[PDB]
Amino acid sequence: MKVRASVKKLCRNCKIVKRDGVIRVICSAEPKHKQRQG
Amino acid sequence: AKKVQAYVKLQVAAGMANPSPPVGPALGQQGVNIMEFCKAFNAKTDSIEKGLPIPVVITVYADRSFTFVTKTPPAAVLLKKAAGIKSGSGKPNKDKVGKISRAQLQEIAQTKAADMTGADIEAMTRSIEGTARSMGLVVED
Amino acid sequence: LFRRIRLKDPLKQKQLLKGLVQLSEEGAVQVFRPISNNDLIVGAVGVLQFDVVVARLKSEYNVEAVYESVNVATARWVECKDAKKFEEFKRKNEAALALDGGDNLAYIATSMVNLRLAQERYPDVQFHQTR
Amino acid sequence: MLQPKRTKFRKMHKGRNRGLAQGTDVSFGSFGLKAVGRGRLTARQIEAARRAMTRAVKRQGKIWIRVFPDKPITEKPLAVRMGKGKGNVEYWVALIQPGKVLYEMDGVPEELAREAFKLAAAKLPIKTTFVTKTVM
Amino acid sequence: MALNLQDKQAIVAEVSEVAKGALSAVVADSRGVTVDKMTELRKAGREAGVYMRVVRNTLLRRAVEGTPFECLKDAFVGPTLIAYSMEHPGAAARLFKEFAKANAKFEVKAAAFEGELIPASQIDRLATLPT
Amino acid sequence: MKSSIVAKLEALHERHEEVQALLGDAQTIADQERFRALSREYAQLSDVSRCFTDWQQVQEDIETAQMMLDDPEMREMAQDELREAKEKSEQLEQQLQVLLLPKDPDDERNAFLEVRAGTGGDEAALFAGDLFRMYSRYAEARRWRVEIMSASEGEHGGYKEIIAKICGDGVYGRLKFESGGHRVQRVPATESQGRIHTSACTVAVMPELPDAELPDINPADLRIDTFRSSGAGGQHVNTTDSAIRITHLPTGIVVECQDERSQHKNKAKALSVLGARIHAAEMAKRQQAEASTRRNLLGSGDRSDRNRTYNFPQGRVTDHRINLTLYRLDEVMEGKLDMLIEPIIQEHQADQLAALSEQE
RNA sequence: AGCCAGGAUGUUGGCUUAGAAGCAGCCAUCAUUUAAAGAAAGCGUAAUAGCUCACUGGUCGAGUCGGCCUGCGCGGAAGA
RNA sequence: GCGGGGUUGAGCAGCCUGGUAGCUCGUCGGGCUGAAAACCCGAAGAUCGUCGGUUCAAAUCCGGCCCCCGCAACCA
């Protein structure tokens, strides 16, 4: 999990979802791609 | 239509019987002996012409036996023995290693398009004419 | 699966030599010395045989006996009945050739394939697995 | 790093940055990067942006730079009191007013220009936008 | 797919061959590989060539739009995806049974073998072809 | 020597055969790291071995041709065949020379040639001048530029020690073998009794190493520490830190500065001293390495340390590293070094190939 | 947007490499089967290979896609 | 921060009121000695540290810069 101020999609499988008022990027394919805005 | 089992396509000219450097361990990886690919293949390579690189199937089965067939010879190596020049390009759009005619590539169509798929002879012929273009060899129309 | 004896402590070599020849006299281990360089390489049929030899050596001949320096070798005793051919063989592969106990010349092969190539070349010379 | 070859005077007053800009339209190329904010672009920032957009377009097409850093900005040396004359020149800036087209580019596709200008704008302090050449 | 202009030019050219041709067969190349398509079409290239059209689009209006002008009884081909096989030289030429051989030649589905309805056929293997 | 080089080529041929067999075995590719080097080894060995094998056939052809000449009255045909064989043998040898020409990038680099007098005194100084002229004319012939960086002239003439930089293409490759002692047997000009005196001179050839770069100190690399300064000064000296210690973590060098009252000035001075110390350490390391290399390449100066002997009464040049005696001494003195330099290059490359074959 | 199938070819484009085949990298990036299929977008191999995939067709049958002018919000936001 | 300096290969004069470059050692070519020194004769040499500026003209005058040598960097 990358805690960044700027969260973006990194590949075609990265999906942006807002959980508990926080923007998060979750990737089904690559575990290295998951980030959370913080 | 069966899928690939273990065959690979890489070998130098037929002139060098039993070539150890290009394949290296490629045909020595499986159970097949080194002598097998010389007795089985070079016995057929002397029938018409020698010195041209031609591929063969390197498939292996569970009975230590194997089948082979020869496809059309690759245009890259063919146009060194049929073009005068022996080297290659590197910058095809900025300089030309040599010059070829139109009939020079027309004459290879009848003897090479048998594996190639096309409705017409010209259709397969232009594919061969474009090989030279990719090789940096220019054609004078 | 031959291993060289480094002998970290320069002295005690005569003690080591007396112990090595005695073990060599029995059948537990075989010692080979290359003619080209003054190196001692000790070989045995099995790994635990080496372990037993090292343990016995420490137990009573009491030397440091530093070993396992990297080397690759195979032992083939060479006998040639023909005169003027064996000399050519010796000159061609002097480095590979190593003396063995009982003053027997043995060809040392880096690889099995090297042994096969050596065997195909010079057919008059006979390579014997057993001495 | 752009800087004037000669100058009439070494130092210049701080000044103000009021008013609007003059170079509002894309004059030479086909695409431009226009400033929507206000501030001053230093020479180092201009050089970094030019390198970024050139590398981004792999040295294809042509690129114009409509700004030039000509204002000398001074500052006093470290740990000195407030008097003792004005400081020494350390870098050069170009005053930017809203609407000023900073860079221009043509000879490359539209989306490639978009990406190049974004990468360039990411190294600049002021906020920018992408503009295209307009007839009349 | 491009705009309607390309769609109409393709349709006017597609239905031209059915207007100037003869009887046709059926084929459903869903699982057909490109190699199968490069050997059957190459085989089809020995008589005239690209004359037979494989321009299939079996949506409810994409290809059904051209049938009322000529060969109106082709609207029954609207649900599942199945292709015709045109023959410009010769009424009901020998190429009709090539999907019968292809039925067991790695293509188990052969589009239910109805055949084009020029003699108002149904489910039957039409073997009566003039030579 | 021809016999030695042919012997090495035969051993290389045997090695080439062994590499083809090892490649065939597939155990090496399983290893992977072993196969990669082995494959390169084969690539270099194959062209030279093929050429050598062809040469071997040509030599055998010459033996059979001589035999053919002696008995069946086929002498005319044999004489033509033998003559053609000779032409072929010479062409193959030139090809071998091309195959064994050095491909190293390092060889192309320019070099500094230093010639220093050893035993003999003024005589040796004069020989140093002769050697310098020899090499200079050779450089001029091959379009190189010789710049005399330093010179120390002898009393009776010549140069006691002369250091020059030769800039060209392939300078280091061509001139690396000249380093070591050189012995001159001749009747000295300084001599009045006509006695022959054996004297020696030491030569060092060093390649021009890449230009020194002072890397700017990296802030992350440095570990600044601020602490109170020692001594007089009152409340201000006690409260203000005013002392900076910077330790360069890669090089492990610590610089402490407490001179000025200002931390900024202390830090600036410390940074300057640290930069100077790093530059000095690098410079010293370079000098120590340069000195060690020079020390090894140069001989003791005694007649025993030799790589070439030049006998002037009999006009003979002898190479000691690889056996070769040439009864010339005039063409060689007037440039034309290629005849001597080439066999050494060929033998050295063969030795390098053998070393590569033996690396594990 | 999902589902199912494909995505083959010359040729392994030309180089140089000890191997370079889409992937160490440098230039072209053409042409054929034309309901499309890429001198290939990557993973990946020790190079091939194998997998996802730029694009083509049935299926369910009503909208869908990302830019502009704007109001108000979210994260970026850690101290005794 | 303040005074002084940068001149043939090295050490140094003179930059004078801006038109103009000198000494010693060194260097080159002959001479002496059998030869090398010492000695004798004849020669040569500089964009006066860098860059702008005012003059018809800058080594000289002005301003900025780099290096070298001193002086000071104290009361807390």
UniProtKB/Swiss-Prot annotation, chain C:
Q: Which domain of life is it from?
A: Bacteria
Q: Which organism is it from?
A: Escherichia coli (strain 55989 / EAEC)
As for subcellular location, the record says: Cytoplasm
Function, as annotated, reads: Increases the formation of ribosomal termination complexes and stimulates activities of RF-1 and RF-2. It binds guanine nucleotides and has strong preference for UGA stop codons. It may interact directly with the ribosome. The stimulation of RF-1 and RF-2 is significantly reduced by GTP and GDP, but not by GMP.
**What's the protein here called?**
Peptide chain release factor 3
Write out the similarity annotation: Belongs to the TRAFAC class translation factor GTPase superfamily. Classic translation factor GTPase family. PrfC subfamily.
Swiss-Prot record, chain D:
The domain of life is Bacteria
Task: Spell out the protein name for this chain.
Answer: Large ribosomal subunit protein uL16
Q: Which UniProt keywords apply?
A: Hydroxylation, Methylation, Ribonucleoprotein, Ribosomal protein, RNA-binding, rRNA-binding, tRNA-binding
Q: How is the protein modified post-translationally, according to the record?
A: Is hydroxylated on Arg-81 by RoxA. The modification is nearly suppressed when E.coli is grown in anoxia.
N-methylmethionine sites (modified residues): 1
This entry carries the following GO cellular component terms, namely: cytoplasm; cytosolic large ribosomal subunit
What are the BP-aspect GO terms?
A: cytoplasmic translation; ribosomal large subunit assembly
Q: What family name appears in the similarity comment?
A: Belongs to the universal ribosomal protein uL16 family.
Carrying (3R)-3-hydroxyarginine, the residues are 81
Keyword Ribosomal protein assigned? yes
A molecular function annotated in GO for this UniProt entry is: rRNA binding
Q: Which organism is it from?
A: Escherichia coli (strain K12)
Q: Name the cystine pairs.
A: none
Q: Does the keyword Secreted apply?
A: no
